[PDB]
Amino acid sequence: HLLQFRKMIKKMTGKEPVVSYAFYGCYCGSGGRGKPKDATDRCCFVHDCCYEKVTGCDPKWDDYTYSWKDGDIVCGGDDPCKKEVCECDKAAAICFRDNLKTYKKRYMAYPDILCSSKSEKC
Amino acid sequence: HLLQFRKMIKKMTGKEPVVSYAFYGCYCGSGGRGKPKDATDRCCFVHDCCYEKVTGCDPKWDDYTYSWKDGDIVCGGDDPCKKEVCECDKAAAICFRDNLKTYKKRYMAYPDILCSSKSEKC
Ligand SMILES: O=P(O)(O)OC[C@H](O)CO
Ligand SMILES: [Ca+2]
Ligand SMILES: [Ca+2]
Numbered sequence: 255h256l257l258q259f260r261k262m263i264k265k266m267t268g269k270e271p272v273v274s275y276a277f278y279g280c281y282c283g284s285g286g287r288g289k290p291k292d293a294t295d296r297c298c299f300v301h302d303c304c305y306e307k308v309t310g311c312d313p314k315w316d317d318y319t320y321s322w323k324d325g326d327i328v329c330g331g332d333d334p335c336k337k338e339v340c341e342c343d344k345a346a347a348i349c350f351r352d353n354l355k356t357y358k359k360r361y362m363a364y365p366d367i368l369c370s371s372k373s374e375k376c
Numbered sequence: 377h378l379l380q381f382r383k384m385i386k387k388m389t390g391k392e393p394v395v396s397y398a399f400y401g402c403y404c405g406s407g408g409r410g411k412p413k414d415a416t417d418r419c420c421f422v423h424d425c426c427y428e429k430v431t432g433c434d435p436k437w438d439d440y441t442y443s444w445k446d447g448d449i450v451c452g453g454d455d456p457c458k459k460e461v462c463e464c465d466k467a468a469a470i471c472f473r474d475n476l477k478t479y480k481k482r483y484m485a486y487p488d489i490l491c492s493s494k495s496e497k498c
Binding site for chain 1: 406435493
């Protein structure tokens with residue numbers, strides 16, 4: 255569920271994701287088009303590609319089972335599909351953390367009309 | 377160029393293109409994800425697919441050559457890339473016109489977050 259994802263991002267970055275990530279670049283939030291603007295945006299691009307490989311559950315709205323151990327996310331439960339969604343979310347949160355060093359406030363609300371017309375393929 | 381597309385939409389539909397189509401459904405305007413919401417939205421999905429296919433010119437920002445003949449759009453010029461973009465735009469404007477019967481106000485400002493997680497393939 256996207257609000258579980260939010261909690262992962264917030265813990266790993268210390269930022270409010272509704273403000274800092276939900277409108278970032280060409281791929282964060284929305285659906286997305288064009289070329290990722292930077293490494294943070296590429297996290298969202300990959301996250302979008304990850305969700306695309308998922309079939310049989312709703313990655314935005316289905317709750318999955320997760321927990322924390324020493325600051326690491328543990329994806330659990332007895333439902334393989336939902337666990338796959340959890341792993342996508344975990345990977346993106348880790349990516350945001352690992353790329354926080356290049357986060358740019360000028361991309362926080364990047365106008366989607368400025369994204370390139372040719373999208374990068376997964 | 378998108379301004380030319382806008383003129384085509386206005387002339388084909390009688391609707392103010394920005395108000396009426398720029399935020400419609402899941403695919404009209406910048407990017408898009410999920411399943412098209414209705415026929416009008418599918419026009420935009422087709423238009424997006426059309427733009428993604430063009431290579432060698434910028435479908436959003438390059439002007440193309442066109443004219444009106446007896447009220448019909450005629451795409452012209454000697455640049456095949458730009459003519460391809462013009463044909464994308466003409467086809468979409470005609471599609472909007474042809475689907476006015478099912479155009480719905482309920483989709484005119486449809487929140488992207490409410491689009492399906494699984495996007496339709498081109
Ligand atoms: O919905 P948030 O607030 O977790 O942010 C959106 C993500 O960055 C993209 O799914
Ligand atoms: Ca996205
Ligand atoms: Ca679109």
